[model samples]
Target: VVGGLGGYMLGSAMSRPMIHFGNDWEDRYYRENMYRYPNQVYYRPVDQYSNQNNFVHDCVNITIKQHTVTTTTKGENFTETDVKMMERVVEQMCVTQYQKESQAYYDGRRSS
Candidate 1:
């Protein structure tokens, strides 16, 4: 199993215990602590909510993620668009599948 060995090596290389934070009000639930890896830097949730207007709402996101960071000292730049695209695609696929499998259930929930 060459493939298995390669997979194991890759896993070992990137395998590190992670710390996470909560992002409520948003559909996402992932946080990458840049402290553990100096090679990378990430900002917290970019939230847009108004306390005055409960009816008015908006959101902006730069939800990008890289598997590995290169420059430990300067925080290397990696393309985050890949992660964002994957997240979007996966979410859409999940919702589509859910609707296909549970259309009646969702319709009932909506009516109630």
Candidate 2:
């Protein structure tokens, strides 16, 4: 009986309502509209056929994300080689992003 009473008290204490609540993007679809990025770009349909090219072309405002890559050994500055390597890495990353955007633009849809 004593054990049962202790458990009842502890169980009562354990159950409580959470005051904090949230209903963010996870609960549903989300779109960016809070603010724009620094290097913003716009999208528009361009020449449908030029130079006998049947391929479609489009223009879109895009935000170039600033990126960085680094390898360090406790130094306050990056050497020229370091900068070159990191710059190349960042460029590749940006290029990949652009390629993806281009694919999406051509595909006419985005992935779920």
Candidate 3:
């Protein structure tokens, strides 16, 4: 038990730096690639699309109601935690797509 605890602590310490480094990289990457509106043409069609369009309307509307779970719940498949996790996963995917679309829109705005 002591050995296992020590190994776990060591693993946690080793992974801490890696996790922080990855977070730093992710933050920098997000700032670098995230679409920013240019001051020259703020009300352009691209702006309307990226800032006002309902690109993530469906994703934003996704709802996951929590339900009770018990040991003898039989064939009931999904739990509250499962639905929450799925909701989060879908939102993340939607955000990724939104970013991509925003970048494309900004790129087109700059070119034309």
Candidate 4:
């Protein structure tokens, strides 16, 4: 499972076209494209923990659930209500409780 495997699954599950299903650079390119497109699946950047107590970011993996989720060029779409629901669910699970990770270091592994 490598090289666009995730993208391939996303494409298939969402009924969309794969952006680039052949290389790591392509996935990085597409991940950058995700930032530019204004609306699509998003890459939520999570910085490693800062010694400062006022640190920002809700996670430490350099990843988080997408802030905005939408379709790619394959033309799938979700309603505004759906988007709000997404926001609520992710916020509750990841940002608020973070039950996904207990105390942020329970199952800790350094980010690559």
By lDDT, the better pick of 1 and 2 is: 1
lDDT of each: 0.29, 0.27, 0.33, 0.33
Q: Write the per-residue lDDT of candidate 2 for residues 1-112, one digit (tens) a residue.
A: 3222221111111111121114565122212311111122222122222321221111110112111111122333444543443333333333343444556677866565
**What would the per-residue lDDT of candidate 1 be over residues 1-112, giving only the tens digit for each residue?**
3222221111111222232223342223323322222221122121321231221111112112222322323565433543443344333333333334356545667753
Q: What C-alpha lDDT, on a 0 to 100 scale, does residue 4 get in candidate 1? A: 22
**Roughly what TM-score does model 3 have, to 2 decimal places?**
0.34
Which residues of candidate 2, in runs, are more than 4 Å off? 1-76, 109-112
lDDT of 1: 0.29
Model 2 clashing residue pairs (backbone): 41-61, 41-62, 42-60, 42-61, 43-59, 43-60, 43-61, 44-59
Choose 2 or 4, whichever is better by lDDT: 4
Candidate 3 has which clashing residue pairs, if any? none
* TM-scores for the candidates: 0.25, 0.30, 0.34, 0.31
Ranking by lDDT: 3, 4, 1, 2
Give the range of the ten consecutive residues with the poorest summed lDDT in model 4: 7-16
- Clashing residue pair totals per candidate (backbone < 3 A): 0, 8, 0, 0
Predicted structure with the largest TM-score when compared to the true one: 3
Better of 2 and 3 by TM-score: 3
What is candidate 3's lDDT per residue for 2-41, written digit by digit as tens? 2222211111110111111235665454345323211110
Supply candidate 2's per-residue lDDT for 17: 18
